[PDB]
Amino acid sequence: HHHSQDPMYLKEIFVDNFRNLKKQKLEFCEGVNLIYGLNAQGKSNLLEAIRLLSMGRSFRGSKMSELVKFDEEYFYVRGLVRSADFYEKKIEFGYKVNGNKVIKVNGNKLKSTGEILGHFLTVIFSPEDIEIIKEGPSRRRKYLDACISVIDKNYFFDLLQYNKTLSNRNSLLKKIKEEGKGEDLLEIFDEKLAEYGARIIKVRNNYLEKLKNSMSKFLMEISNEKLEIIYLNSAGVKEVHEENLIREKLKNRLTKSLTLDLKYLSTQVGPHREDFKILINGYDSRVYSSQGQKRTAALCLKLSELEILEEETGEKPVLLLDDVMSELDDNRKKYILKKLEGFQSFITHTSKSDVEGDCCFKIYDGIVDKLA
Amino acid sequence: HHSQDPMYLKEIFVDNFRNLKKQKLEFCEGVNLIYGLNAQGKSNLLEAIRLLSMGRSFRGSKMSELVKFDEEYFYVRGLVRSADFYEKKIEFGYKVNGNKVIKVNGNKLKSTGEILGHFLTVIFSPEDIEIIKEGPSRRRKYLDACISVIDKNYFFDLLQYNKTLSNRNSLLKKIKEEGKGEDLLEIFDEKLAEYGARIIKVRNNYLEKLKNSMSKFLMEISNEKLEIIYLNSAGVKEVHEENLIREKLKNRLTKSLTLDLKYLSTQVGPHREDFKILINGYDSRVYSSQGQKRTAALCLKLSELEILEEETGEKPVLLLDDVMSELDDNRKKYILKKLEGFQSFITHTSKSDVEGDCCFKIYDGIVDKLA
Ligand SMILES: Nc1ncnc2c1ncn2[C@@H]1O[C@H](COP(=O)(O)OP(=O)(O)OP(O)(O)=S)[C@@H](O)[C@H]1O
């Protein structure tokens, strides 16, 4: 329930010592904001600054200290956003090289970084999205956790507490190994991991269900191929619903894992070792397909992220398109650029001819010049 | 044993078996190469041979499917020698009206399972990677077949267990459609727990030996560490006292009644177990490369063979079903020497680029020594 259907909208952003960007305030437009310039001038840095306001981290996976302008002691980003319930919401993110970060919403300091989700909703499309198709469980897992956490605060809560308990269990393993004086205390942590692990598996399944439905729709439209998604959960359950059952299986598996865990000083059982497999027609897309369909599968995955996010939050997000509008024979552009219709979008490119923005910004040397 | 003579199939006689013509084949004690364009003929032969070990089709086919088209029966007769037998005759007769006749040295076996393992084979196939790739049931059935060949007590138990389970499951739907029958349930539960406990103890024993063999082969082939985790349905990982395993199984049977009534299935028991195959602490089903999966499949089978020899004192015949298709002829030569003092049957497409001691060409169901 919201007071309006005003889409998410970034009125302006202010960047101070952020990457190579000069200290500046940028005011944006409704519709397509074209950001163009030579390679390495600051295009992706600006998208990274905008995406920071949504996630509280670099979409590139960079450490915070890497976003600080070389030889400075802090960076600071401030966005003013409009959303369905807010004519204006101020979002501030300051980070100092000594580790101190200060995140504020409407002038109130957030107690943790995760509390920044999703005051400002974005979906970012990037060439590296094909890595979610190609790389290991870790990549897919990090992606899934972020998709869900953005729309579901209780899951994010669970994930945070799970990781905390996991960390405690792992250090306990060290303490048991470093002595003879502890295998025992593991039971109570085991019980907790199974409870939180089961809640997480349940929600991951709910999302993957929705993911498969939406992706099957998109895939069948542009490639006429058939999508399946297999969730390799840690409970070994091929069809997950009874949370009771999953809890017991996870707990049994933890107990049977004790010797192995003492050897590796880690926990092989749980959500943090899971994966999901993406199947095209019947084959594993990670291995059995070419680069045409991986790029296609990546697109469908992200199109689905967008669709699920809108439906679950009742908000319309801002779209970030990083270096994904090059190439593109133009019926393959005619499809996407019209799909951007009712959104505010930020599109990076090499030229301002190819794509027509409603507002256009040239960046050279970290300096952003509105209107070429 | 009175000796250490290897298992050796001197000859086989097939009558109305699949597409095979009626014929006697005589084999050598080394490499027997079977080749040809044919897909079925090459395999039908391996199926006849493997029948003499397992008393079933390794293709999962019903017996009636092994019978040639317009015929009323098939018949397979093998002559074998093993550590204690200069010659042992094994005959398998099946008529389409149903009656199986299995005989060893002229004596009829009262049950099909008694054929295990008068004649030991291990069969290698590209399909073996599915044991690494696929789900609990594929691993479970493989385990059951490996153990059953060695241990006929286990095979027995497994039959009584399976029979009891189906009865129990038929009863679950009576309890839910009518409103009674939990009295038989408690009786079935006691029976499932008893047999289940015996099954679990032996599986644990086997998987321990499997872990040791497999980890040795893997450490030598790839210098990676192998672990096996046996997820027994008693939820213990402390498996040698059948008494306590019974109690645990019985308890869990009780606690999952509601589940069982809903799905009309039985959630607790060895019929739902699994074991994890881990490389360097990570689940091979989830984290392992394609190469790693094939290597692990190899190690699994090398281990099956090592444990079978150690447990029985017999050296099995090796069946290599189309595993030479995609190899190098330096890797083809490698293996050939590793076969050493076994009898082996190898199916291929060509006659060269592998060495063998007896070559057979199968075309149109006739197996012809030498082309
Ligand atoms: N912390 C930092 N301080 C100063 N300069 C930085 C910092 N981090 C990166 N840079 C530089 O800033 C540039 C990065 O600009 P980007 O926006 O990534 O390039 P871009 O080509 O405009 O974006 P894409 O991905 O091609 S659309 C490079 O020249 C980096 O060396």
Residue numbers in the entry:
A (entry chain A): -6 to 365
B (entry chain B): -5 to 365
The authors write:
RecF is a multifunctional protein involved in recombinant DNA repair, homologous genetic recombination, and DNA replication. Similar to RecR and RecO, RecF is a recombination mediator protein (RMP) in the RecFOR pathway for ssDNA gap repair. RecF contains the conserved Walker A motif, Walker B motif and signature motif of ABC-ATPase that exhibits ATP-dependent dimerization; additionally, the signature motif residues interact with the ATP bound to the opposite molecule. To gain insight into the mechanism of ABC-ATPase RecF, we solved the crystal structures of TTERecF, TTERecF-ATP, and TTERecF-ATPɤS.
The structure of TTERecF-ATPɤS is also a dimer, that is completely different from the dimer of TTERecF-ATP and is thus another conformation of TTERecF. In the TTERecF-ATPɤS structure, domain I of the two monomers interacted, whereas their respective domain II structures were located far from each another. The dimer contact surface was 2613 Å2, which was 7.7% of the dimer total surface area (33774 Å2). The two monomers of TTERecF-ATPɤS were dissimilar; one monomer consisted of TTERecF-ATPɤS and the other consisted of TTERecF only. One monomer structure (ATPɤS binding) was nearly similar to one monomer of TTERecF-ATP dimer, including the active site conformation of the Walker A motif, Walker B motif, and signature motif. The Cα atoms of these two structures can be superimposed with an r.m.s.d of 0.807 Å. The other monomer structure (no ATPɤS binding) was similar to that of the free TTERecF; the r.m.s.d of the superimposed Cα atoms was 1.121 Å. According to the structure and interface of electrostatic potential, the interacting amino acids were mainly located in the RecF helix αF from the structure of TTERecF-ATPɤS. Thus, we were sure that the RecF helix αF is the interface of the RecF-ATPrS dimer. In addition, the DNA binding affinities of the TTERecF-ATPɤS dimer for 21-mer ssDNA and dsDNA were 466 nM and 381 nM, which did not significantly differ from those of the native TTERecF. The structural and biochemical data showed that the TTERecF-ATPɤS dimer cannot stably bind with DNA.
